[PDB]
Amino acid sequence: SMMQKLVVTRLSPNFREAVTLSRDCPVPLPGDGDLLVRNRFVGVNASDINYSAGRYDPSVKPPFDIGFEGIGEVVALGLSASARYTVGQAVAYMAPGSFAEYTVVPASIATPVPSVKPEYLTLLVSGTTAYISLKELGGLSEGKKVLVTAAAGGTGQFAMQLSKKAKCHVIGTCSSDEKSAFLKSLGCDRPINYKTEPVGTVLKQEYPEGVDVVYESVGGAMFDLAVDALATKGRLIVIGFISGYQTPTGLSPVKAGTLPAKLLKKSASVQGFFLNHYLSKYQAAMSHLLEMCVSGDLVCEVDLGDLSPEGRFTGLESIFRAVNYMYMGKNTGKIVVELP
């Protein structure tokens, strides 16, 4: 009857500053097309702080709901919805307002899953971004060289594995030897711990002919280095620029004045990807990801914060600590919060 949820109360890229835990909120009811989902696991996303900062609709003022993705059970559903879905059914979704004990979700955008496991939630945003971007924009083929940044992260792990399944040679960047060992176990050809080995040196000394594809999530100096490392007809996909999201503009500084000249001289491209522009591809991607997840052909690494200082990310209140864990570079795989 009553539930907790996170609410953006003030526009800020600092999540603690922007977001309030409300305690005594009414449990909303599903429309005729709508499911009501008991959230069991919610995904933490780099762009949670872009959403809290208001960078999606700068018209929209607080208060508003937050959280992009959830997995759980249908507890209620409208009549139309009850054609395809039933109460107690395991479902996952990508829709704003997952950071709640219960969320209303249009049946038309729900993904049926085999059970409530956090591994299936890793696919909804992180998996589908890597799958659709690389398939529509990567032009991957046997022997291509792929650089993946934030390679041991939520979406990074999927860029790494999908590139390997395409029989590419894969380089992955990360901030620890533990993360390097994770990348090697995923079949990464050249893991780089950029804390102990300068990435620019590795690419100069081991990849003098450069790389065909960059899955670039980090921005700043990592972007500039990826541009310099492009082969003739190379493709840098701008997945994100996490290094800038905490700043007041949300932008990371890049050497952009000489960029059009570098791309002309290499016949090379910088291509942006936003998942919400490729929804016509989402169903097929999520189906193929699930088949690989269930079969064990795809590692779907989940970071529930068990080895963090204050331990497992349990409850809505743990989302503040889980966002900080991400921005401290501490996670291996997808950061997930459990609502028990």
Ligand X SMILES: NC(=O)c1ccc[n+]([C@@H]2O[C@H](COP(=O)([O-])OP(=O)(O)OC[C@H]3O[C@@H](n4cnc5c(N)ncnc54)[C@H](OP(=O)(O)O)[C@@H]3O)[C@@H](O)[C@H]2O)c1
Ligand Y SMILES: Cc1ccc(-c2cc(C(F)(F)F)nn2-c2ccc(S(N)(=O)=O)cc2)cc1
Calpha distance 177→97 (Å, rounded): 36
Q: Which of these segments, 11-19, 36-44, 108-116, 236-244, binds a second copy (CB under 8 A)?
A: 236-244
* Ranges within 139-198 binding ligand X (CB under 6 A): 150, 152-156, 173-175, 179
What are the residues facing 20 on neighbouring strands? 7
Q: E strand or H helix at 183, and its extent?
A: helix 177-185
Is 17:317 a contact under the CB 8 Å cutoff?
no
Rg (CA), the chain: 20
Question: How many chain residues are in contact with ligand X, going by CB under 6 A?
Answer: 31
If contact means CB under 5 to 8 A according to the sort of partner, which of ligand Y, ligand X, a second copy, none does residue 126 touch?
ligand X
Task: Report the Cα–Cα distance between both ends of the chain, in Å, rounded.
Answer: 17
Each residue 51-70 as x (binds ligand Y by CB under 6 A) or -, in order, gives ----xx--------------
- HEC secondary structure over 185-212: HCCCCEEEECCCCCHHHHHHHHCCCCEE
Q: Does 59 appear as a known binding residue? A: no
Q: Pick from 60, 256, 279, 328: which binds a second copy (CB under 8 A)?
A: 256
At 275, list the tokens. Answer: 């998942």
Q: Does 93 appear as a known binding residue? A: no
* Ranges within 18-47 binding ligand X (CB under 6 A): 45-47
CB of 232 to a second copy, least distance (A): 6
The DSSP bridge pattern shows strands 69-77 and 90-94 to be: antiparallel
Is 304:268 a contact under the CB 8 Å cutoff?
no
- Residue 240 binds to ligand Y (criterion: CB under 6 A): yes
> What residue numbers does the annotated binding site for NADP(+) cover?
155, 175, 179, 194, 217, 239, 245, 273-275, 331
Give the interface with ligand X as residue ranges (CB under 6 A): 45-47, 125-126, 129, 150, 152-156, 173-175, 179, 217-218, 239-243, 273-275, 326-327, 329, 331, 335
Give the interface with a second copy as residue ranges (CB under 8 A): 219, 223, 232-233, 238-241, 250-254, 256-274, 277-278
